[PDB]
């Protein structure tokens, strides 16, 4: 642990184009394993990992028919929110939802959660008690009053505690080897000089999975977080990720600096230093 089963839902109104677009995307430990998209040729739930091809036809039909029902609900919710904010029907708006559960190595429920957002702003969220809600604005207080008097939080609690956990538990067993997943980074340091008294040292990390990683530059012990520059982790487009961090140093002082790569797949953190051929 901690293992997670999250479902990411998007609903976007598209006036003067067509019907609203709808997407559900399931994740297992932040790994896309299922997906539904209304703008596909024939909208159905499809596997996004090859370990999901185990599941039978009754599973896919059930999940597919469920998604179409969900689409219609969010179709109504989009028109409801126009009313709450008194907004025009000829403008595009986006409803997003993340709904999932997390379990530890033992299997116990650590955190269950469900939270909504309208036009990229928090709308309403289920508290960690799985009993009460938290409205983000006056519009969301209308929804808060409904679901509390409707006793909706309790019905969600059943799904999150029971169903979500039990199915998450099932997926982990079907994709244990695939989700055990680790590619160690290939790392190196490039030198980028300039007509100036300084040079740029750039530490690379390539071909690694999962995307969780930390690169640091150090000067004789201490880490140079402030003067460091780094890019956000990025997909290579083949299942692996890339990242680099860099530092500007005085000319002729390259051997004073040390790059460090921290990653799961490594037996121990890599320690890199600028070295020419020459």
């Amino acid at each position: 642990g901690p293992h997670s089963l999250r479902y990411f839902v998007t609903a976007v109104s598209r006036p003067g184009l067509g019907e609203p677009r709808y997407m559900e995307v399931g994740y297992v430990d932040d790994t896309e394993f299922v997906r539904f998209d209304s703008d596909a040729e024939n909208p159905r739930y499809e596997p996004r990992a090859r370990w999901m091809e185990q599941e039978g036809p009754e599973y896919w039909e059930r999940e597919t028919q469920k998604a179409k029902g969900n689409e219609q609900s969010f179709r109504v919710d989009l028109r409801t929110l126009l009313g709450y904010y008194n907004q025009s029907k000829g403008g595009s708006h986006t409803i997003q939802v993340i709904s999932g559960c997390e379990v530890g190595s033992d299997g116990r429920l650590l955190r269950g959660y469900q939270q909504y957002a309208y036009d990229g702003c928090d709308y309403i969220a289920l508290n960690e008690d799985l009993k009460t809600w938290t409205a983000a604005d006056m519009a969301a207080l209308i929804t808060k009053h409904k679901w509390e008097q409707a006793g909706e939080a309790e019905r969600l609690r059943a799904y999150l505690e029971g169903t979500c956990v039990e199915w998450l538990r099932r997926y982990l067993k079907n994709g244990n080897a695939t989700l055990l997943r680790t590619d160690s980074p290939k790392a190196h340091v490039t030198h980028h000089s300039r007509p100036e008294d300084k040079v740029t040292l750039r530490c690379w990390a390539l071909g690694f999975y999962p995307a969780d990683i930390t690169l640091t530059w150090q000067l004789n012990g201490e880490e140079l977080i402030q003067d460091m520059e780094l890019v956000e982790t990025r997909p290579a487009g083949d299942g692996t990720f890339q990242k680099w961090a860099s530092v500007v140093v005085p000319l002729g002082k390259e051997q004073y600096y040390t790059c460090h790569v921290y990653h799961q797949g490594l037996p121990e953190p890599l320690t890199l230093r600028w070295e020419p051929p020459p």
Binding site: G26, I124, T143, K146, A150, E152, Y159, C164, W167
Partner: peptide, 9 residues
């Protein structure tokens, strides 16, 4: 197993 029967806002 995605959530079914989403409550209306």
């Amino acid at each position: 197993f995605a959530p079914g029967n989403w409550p209306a806002l």
